[PDB]
Structure 1
Amino acid sequence: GSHMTEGTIKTSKYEIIAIFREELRKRTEIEIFFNNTSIITQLTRVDFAEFHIQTHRKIPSGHKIRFLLHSDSGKIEFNAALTKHDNSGVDKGIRYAFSLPECLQVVQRRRDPRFRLRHEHDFYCRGRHKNGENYLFDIKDISDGGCALMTKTPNLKFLSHNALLKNAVLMLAEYGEITIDLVVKNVIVITLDNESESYYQISCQFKFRHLDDQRRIEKILLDLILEAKRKK
């Protein structure tokens, strides 16, 4: 375009490449999110098709990863899938290659995907495990990417890391029901002391079946967030 600056959304391949090369040169901090974890590092290489980072951590593959480039111009958020990985022979670290993003969004706000919203609503998740056993969970918090489920009587063998809860149903009161697949990410036991009660919290990632399902979730979020703000 004719202006110096214009879009918070970048889709031009040439601009995107140009932006990565510049941030590389400025040693801009890149933040990588996966599951529970966030690491800060720098871009180690930029070419026409891919960008590299190096880290000793294991990062899930075959899945789009959330990034944040903490540029001077604002946070540049994008998703990118891992294409290659091996040992970059620096303290024997791992060199990851990611495909260049095809869309960038410059935001001034830090949108940490690891955070989930607490609420007052009567939301539950019901379904059957692989062996036909019924389960029920309280939906304690929720984001557009996942939720925390809670129960005092978990069937732990079906809740291992990356275990899949297929055909799980989100009972969302006034918002209706949403059948979805959940990927178990993390299980912790929270104990309240005052007699003692232990609650199991299972953190899950949504595997949506349609955009319509995600949009419904996003509308609920906007309602919950608004409610939470009005609560201050």
Structure 2
Amino acid sequence: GSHMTEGTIKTSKYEIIAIFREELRKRTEIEIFFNNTSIITQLTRVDFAEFHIQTHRKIPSGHKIRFLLHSDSGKIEFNAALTKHDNSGVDKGIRYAFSLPECLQVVQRRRDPRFRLRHEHDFYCRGRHKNGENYLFDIKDISDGGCALMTKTPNLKFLSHNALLKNAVLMLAEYGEITIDLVVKNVIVITLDESESYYQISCQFKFRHLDDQRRIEKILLDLILEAKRKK
């Protein structure tokens, strides 16, 4: 760098640790995202390879968790794989060691992955349950990580927690279709009152191929933009 203004994307292994070490010492709040849950805590340690955080909550392993560092300079976005966990020697506290991010991204606005765009299109999801039975869902809202499906007559047997919905077809109207695996994250029954009941089904996208992801991100962009031309 030669000017004052900084680049927002950090790929330097040395600046990264430097960034994490400073924020640790400032007790900079770190936000941890997973499913519809978010928790606020602090960095409990930083070595050359991994950063630490402690919490009683149980964070899912085997896939990079979304993070948000609330530093004075702005929100520092990054993903990090869970690389180790065990009791923190503090009552019920779990110790989480995440591999240091290899790319930070400093932004100014809050980007909460838990929130989904509520389109205005008629989107559907069709497919067959493992017992051959057919299912049809309305796609209420959507995001590059998941969606909310809705139906008044669901087959709950195939809709338990972390249940699977493989090769499901995202009927996305004009944008075409997209065959993908969905894993049920949680199910609730909304009741209007006539005592209509709707089963909202929250699903995490499990891609058969990353190409699907690049498309669902563009489609999303065309909607967020479409939400601004209408107003």
TM interval, shorter chain, is: over 0.9
Partners in 2 of 1:69 and 1:231 — Cα distance?
A: 34
- Listed one character per residue, the Cα deviations across residues 104-135 of structure 1 (whole Å, up to 9, x for unaligned) are 10010111000011122111011111111111
- Listed one character per residue, the Cα deviations across residues 179-232 of structure 1 (whole Å, up to 9, x for unaligned) are 001111111101111x11000011111112333211221122112212323445
Partners in 1 of 2:120 and 2:3 — Cα distance?
A: 47
What TM-score do you get using the length of structure 1 for normalisation?
0.96
Identity, in percent, stands at 100
1:134 is aligned to 134
- Listed one character per residue, the Cα deviations across residues 21-44 of structure 1 (whole Å, up to 9, x for unaligned) are 010011100000010111000000
Q: CA deviation at 1:139?
A: 0.4
Query: Which structure 2 residue ranges, 5 or more long, are not aligned?
Result: none
Which deviates further from its counterpart, 214-223 or 43-52? 214-223
Which deviates further from its counterpart, 201-210 or 125-134? 201-210
Partners in 2 of 1:92 and 1:192 — Cα distance?
A: 40
Partners in 2 of 1:169 and 1:81 — Cα distance?
A: 29
- DSSP-derived class of the 1:106 partner: strand
Q: CA deviation at 1:160?
A: 1.2
- Listed one character per residue, the Cα deviations across residues 30-69 of structure 1 (whole Å, up to 9, x for unaligned) are 0000101110000000001111101111111111100000
CA RMSD of aligned residues (A): 1.2
- DSSP-derived class of the 2:224 partner: helix
Partners in 1 of 2:112 and 2:22 — Cα distance?
A: 24
Q: CA deviation at 1:5?
A: 4.5
- DSSP-derived class of the 1:132 partner: coil
Q: CA deviation at 1:4?
A: 4.7
Aligned residues: 231
- DSSP-derived class of the 2:110 partner: coil
- DSSP-derived class of the 2:192 partner: strand
Query: Which structure 1 residue ranges, 5 or more long, are not aligned?
Result: none
1:182 is aligned to 182
